[PDB]
Amino acid sequence: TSYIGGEGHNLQEHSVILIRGGRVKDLPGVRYHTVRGALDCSGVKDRKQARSKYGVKRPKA
Amino acid sequence: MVTIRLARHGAKKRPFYQVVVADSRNARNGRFIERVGFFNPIASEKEEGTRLDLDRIAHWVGQGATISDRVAALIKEVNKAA
Amino acid sequence: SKEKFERTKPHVNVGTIGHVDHGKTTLTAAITTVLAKTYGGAARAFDQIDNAPEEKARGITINTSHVEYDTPTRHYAHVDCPGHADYVKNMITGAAQMDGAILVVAATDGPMPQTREHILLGRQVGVPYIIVFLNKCDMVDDEELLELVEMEVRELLSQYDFPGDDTPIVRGSALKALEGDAEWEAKILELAGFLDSYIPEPERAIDKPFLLPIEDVFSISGRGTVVTGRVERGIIKVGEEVEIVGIKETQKSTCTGVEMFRKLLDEGRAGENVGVLLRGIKREEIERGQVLAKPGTIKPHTKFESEVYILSKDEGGRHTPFFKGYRPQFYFRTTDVTGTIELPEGVEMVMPGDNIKMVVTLIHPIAMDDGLRFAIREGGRTVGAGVVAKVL
Amino acid sequence: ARYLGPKLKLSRREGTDLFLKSGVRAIDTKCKIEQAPGQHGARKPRLSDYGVQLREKQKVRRIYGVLERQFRNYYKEAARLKGNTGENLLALLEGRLDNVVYRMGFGATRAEARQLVSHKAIMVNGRVVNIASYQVSPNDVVSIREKAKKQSRVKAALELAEQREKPTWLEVDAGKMEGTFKRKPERSDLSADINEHLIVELYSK
Amino acid sequence: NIKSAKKRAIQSEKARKHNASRRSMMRTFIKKVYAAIEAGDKAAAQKAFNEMQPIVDRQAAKGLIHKNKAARHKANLTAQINKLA
RNA sequence: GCCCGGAUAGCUCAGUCGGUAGAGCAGGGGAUUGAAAAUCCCCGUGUCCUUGGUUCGAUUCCGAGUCCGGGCACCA
RNA sequence: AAUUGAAGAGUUUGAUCAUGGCUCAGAUUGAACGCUGGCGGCAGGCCUAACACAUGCAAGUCGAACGGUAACAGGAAGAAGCUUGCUUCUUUGCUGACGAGUGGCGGACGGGUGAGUAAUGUCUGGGAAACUGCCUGAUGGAGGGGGAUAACUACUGGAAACGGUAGCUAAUACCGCAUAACGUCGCAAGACCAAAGAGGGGGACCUUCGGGCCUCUUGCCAUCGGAUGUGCCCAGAUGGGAUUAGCUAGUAGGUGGGGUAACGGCUCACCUAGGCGACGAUCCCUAGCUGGUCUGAGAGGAUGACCAGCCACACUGGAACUGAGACACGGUCCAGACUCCUACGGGAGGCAGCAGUGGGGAAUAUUGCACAAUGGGCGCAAGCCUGAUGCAGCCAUGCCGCGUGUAUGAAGAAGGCCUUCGGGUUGUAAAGUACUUUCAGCGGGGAGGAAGGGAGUAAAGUUAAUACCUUUGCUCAUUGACGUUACCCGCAGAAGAAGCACCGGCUAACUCCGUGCCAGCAGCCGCGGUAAUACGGAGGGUGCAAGCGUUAAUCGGAAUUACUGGGCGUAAAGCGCACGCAGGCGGUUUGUUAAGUCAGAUGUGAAAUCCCCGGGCUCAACCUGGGAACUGCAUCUGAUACUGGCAA
């Protein structure tokens, strides 16, 4: 079982995604995090800070 | 068969051959009996650049070492007179 | 792959279109066979074209197969097409490169519902010079209705503003000619005449920054990915760093090899429908719809402006106007990107027959430029035609 | 590589005038010094043990314009030499070519000295050198290369060095634009306002 | 595989037909002696030994037998009959 | 490229056999609390995946399109 | 000169001290992912599927071994046009050379991969029961003949592959005979064992005019050596599990025969009934080993990618042949699985060689250039071959260097943010102004890596010789893939080049707004319930910088496996008690031995790496000379206190 960081996502019953380590310590038994920005999982919408994490590309303009 | 030949050491575009005595059936930088001197082709107009211990070399010639032409070219360059 | 291409003739793109069971693929077999008599190395058989197992069993060509032959004047790259309503995707892609088609219409059934759709699409994409071929002439000999069919064919070309009267109509039996019946054999050669005459040697833009639309991605056993395409502008030589711009994030590659019809070719140039080998690009990476361009010349877009003409309901088109947010399918060069229409102010219902305009936001970033002509289809028929007015 | 940002803001953070914008002017006076490192600069810091060691590392690094990866190497180089880890660390920074050009007075600021060395206008022993990180050996002569000699920037800067300390370890001609770098710099001769002891305490852990 | 040095394939097969013939004739003279030892004839065994001696030694010269294998046949076979004669 | 299915509130599902859309769990709202739970007094809170036709009317009829799943083909 | 080196913080509690884990600060990596991205230098680049592989290439070479000449170019007799010597041109191995063939050498090297292997391997130190092509030393020979065969011809099978039958011919191919010794066998006498010729030049002589004869180079045979390499044996060391305690029957040893280059149950027949095992046998799982790499104050801990040594494997299993050497990557035979061709009879293939493809995977590159250099094979040499190697390509993967400008500049602007609405802050930052131009871009110059080799010439050896050959000098024309090189000069213009994470504590740096236990953050403690320095945005600040963070991994801190360096009354931990085998330890006196210990010496501890003082690329990384070191091991010579043996 893996956690989905960032506000809002689009994962649904399928859609192959990437998994990195790291526990949450808020949910007993969750020891992984999904990589937002990697595979079929889109990054967080409207981030402006800490966007290396959360897979957000720098604004075009 | 023992052979007195060079060995391409050094970086890219900057060779440094180490005249050594190895068996002829080995790699250039493979197993060798003993290294005897060296040869820096692009040293500089300086204090050093080429040394060959002619006493140990002459011992192996009496033993049957087939010196390569490139090394036999260097025996001439370290003159048996000066 | 072996045996380098010997550049001697002008390269013209042609190909059969028309209703199912009128003899599109048989003719394509028939042409190459007859032309083999005036040309040493050729003769693609019927099964050579319909090699796909479904095409084998069902007996229908569902994949545009590219064959070639030549009159000692020009060089022909023939693209057979699927006259099967549900297989429009393939027809368009084939007709997109079509520099003058060979409309096959059987004397048996005269004009058909699909022949009507082909011409319409032929006009939409801009297939300029349509040769016609009355096949199955061995069937009927009543020269009256032969002339009556020939009449009704011109009638259709008429309302689709192609020069119907001055359009060459060639009678003949594509079938019988295939075995070598000297009688019907000549009829093939008769169309070969209009094939070199009626169609001129087209204008090419070889000095432009190279561009190549991608119709079909191949995975050659041992070499990698081969992107097929007719060079729309510029030329390309093996080693030239090209990079893909299209419906997904742009990658970079290099033409490790260029070929045409399994004949090696060091330098491809505008109009030539060549296959390009790419530098380490997997199959899921590059796919149909993307464009192959020289670095930095073109980048994708999802916003612009254009025009629209809606033809009548008894000609295809629409009969009921649409409101805002209506999202059709945009066909330009090799795609069908579906996009939302951003109508101009107060425009409640866009009545079928206007030539106003609109604005669009779509789902796939694509290679654009002002002056990019494109069809607009929906529900088994074209609804509109429009060219990129301005980038929004 | 280089900082190239607001180079007087650094002096406000460290507190002291780090000669970054020494220039033609004698005293800065126009940066609202000592009381404004930033927006909340009016406030005093907690300044813990790690805080005093860090600031002491930055102050030394901001002066000579070195970067961390390169500054870490100088310590690792000083830590393996003989003598004293702290003193030898400063001897390496006092040997840099961009520092010499500043010490010789050929350039106004260490960045301008770096501008002079980088734009092939500084020669040592008759050899053109671009690297500002050139480790000048003892008993070497450095001078401006003939072509870019006395061109509106060196002249004004050489006159500026008249109003400085004019160090002991290095002799300068001042007329033919050729400084003579003698023996290595002693600790008693250099800065002294900085503490080399704290830098070793930072890299020890 | 395709190497123009597939000559060594047929040349070695041309040689194994030859070397086998010589190892065959060498063993027929050696076994001729043991036939005379089982018969205990110290004159007949001495006869075959004085006849297999040149045959077993000429193979050392041809490089077939390693000269030590031949020397071992002259050693033990003599040690056999001298206990018998 | 082809063929075949699935998509109904925040979550889980009923529903058509053209007629103006439901159930339960949750959620939001007032009093109480530091804020909740519990108790009491209230509101579906939906582009029926999107879009265009067939009609007075489409979740339910027929075509394009999107995401996904399964099978299949293609090889300059 | 050659280890000048060792740190702590958060968290159980109302608070404290202990015990005790968890987590962080460091370094490192064959790294992957996200955001971002200017250049150069030097290195690295399939860790997973030892999965399946299209295409090209990775091992050829000698005519100075031989018969030949099918090609290409000459020489030569002749032939035909026709400008009678301008050419056309058929014969012709007669020369230069050279396909196919015989023969010699190489193909066992070089390159790759890490499946197997827990000891048959490796490391260390010794040993004797051995062989060793090419290379080289010493001592002799190198006499005289024969029988075939490929190529090549005629015919002919077969789609191809690949042959078949009968004849023709050569040799440094093959088989004898003579000859043998300090060679082998034998106690000895004696018996027995080898060989090959080619090529350059040439006076006298000799010529059946092939050639003999003189001479020089080279190769062949024999024997003992040397060197190198390889085979073998012994001792110590070399993972985890006892929830694996008995294991073995050619098995342990002996005798005789056979076998190997060589010792040996290596293998057979008979005889004895032993042999391994708690100081870990058998069995099971995992694993190539080492020099070394990372970490560490050290002792250790983890590990074995690149470079180098050794071993193992070559689609899977097995076997043998040729040979100095294999029981063989690009060899043979057989079987099997899987692909491929087929004229259905029968054949072809093995990328764990360089690239490249599909697949697997979080993830790892060009179907490039050249043999110029170094090395190798062959050859007298010239040369031919060399996917070894040298370079270039691709990727920020890592380490190192540089740049993105410098100085000046208060109206301390505008706009943004904050505010006690005074002002502060961004911020000398910008603009403005005066200069510079690194690296990129463009145009000219231009090292070094090149040594040799070839032709000619002179002299000195050689010899009958001014000849041939060899050697040392000299002269002329040259040999560079990289390469539009490194580097130097010139032209224009601040011109083309700054992000990433963090800001509650640990830990460097704070406010405002929005959202209200919702959305979300988090390495650990924990934030968020309408006043959040912790969430999201904005302003400012901090760290680092063409990189920055996140994840994974090893060590560190962890004296939290404690030999250095811990514990057991109550925190985890004294068997319920006792007798007692093996084991560990053992009072006191003398003598002796000298296993342990110690001192000295010798040999070895491959090179690289690490460390020290230097040298060279503009510096650095990198390369590099010398030295130290390699903390180990083995033998010998001595010491005799302490431990052990021995005697009283």
Ligand SMILES: Nc1nc2c(ncn2[C@@H]2O[C@H](COP(=O)(O)OP(=O)(O)CP(=O)(O)O)[C@@H](O)[C@H]2O)c(=O)[nH]1
């Ligand atoms: N008697 C007769 N039969 C004919 C003639 N031409 C074709 N036929 C047959 O008609 C059939 C259809 O051939 P095909 O050429 O594939 O048709 P198509 O119209 O291309 C089909 P698709 O719709 O897939 O592209 C074949 O059986 C062909 O042999 C003709 O002239 N005469």
Ligand SMILES: *C(=O)[C@@H](N)Cc1ccccc1
């Ligand atoms: C390869 O032949 C291309 N040049 C033309 C083509 C043929 C068939 C299908 C697709 C492309």
Ligand SMILES: [Mg+2]
């Ligand atoms: Mg067809």
Ligand SMILES: [Mg+2]
């Ligand atoms: Mg049909």
Ligand SMILES: [Mg+2]
């Ligand atoms: Mg019909």
Ligand SMILES: [Mg+2]
């Ligand atoms: Mg850097």
Ligand SMILES: [Mg+2]
């Ligand atoms: Mg508490």
Ligand SMILES: [Mg+2]
């Ligand atoms: Mg592998």
Ligand SMILES: [Mg+2]
């Ligand atoms: Mg292959």
Ligand SMILES: [Mg+2]
């Ligand atoms: Mg030949």
Ligand SMILES: [Mg+2]
């Ligand atoms: Mg090898």
Ligand SMILES: [Mg+2]
């Ligand atoms: Mg036949």
Ligand SMILES: [Mg+2]
């Ligand atoms: Mg012989």
Ligand SMILES: [Mg+2]
């Ligand atoms: Mg004897």
Ligand SMILES: [Mg+2]
């Ligand atoms: Mg003879």
Ligand SMILES: [Mg+2]
């Ligand atoms: Mg015996």
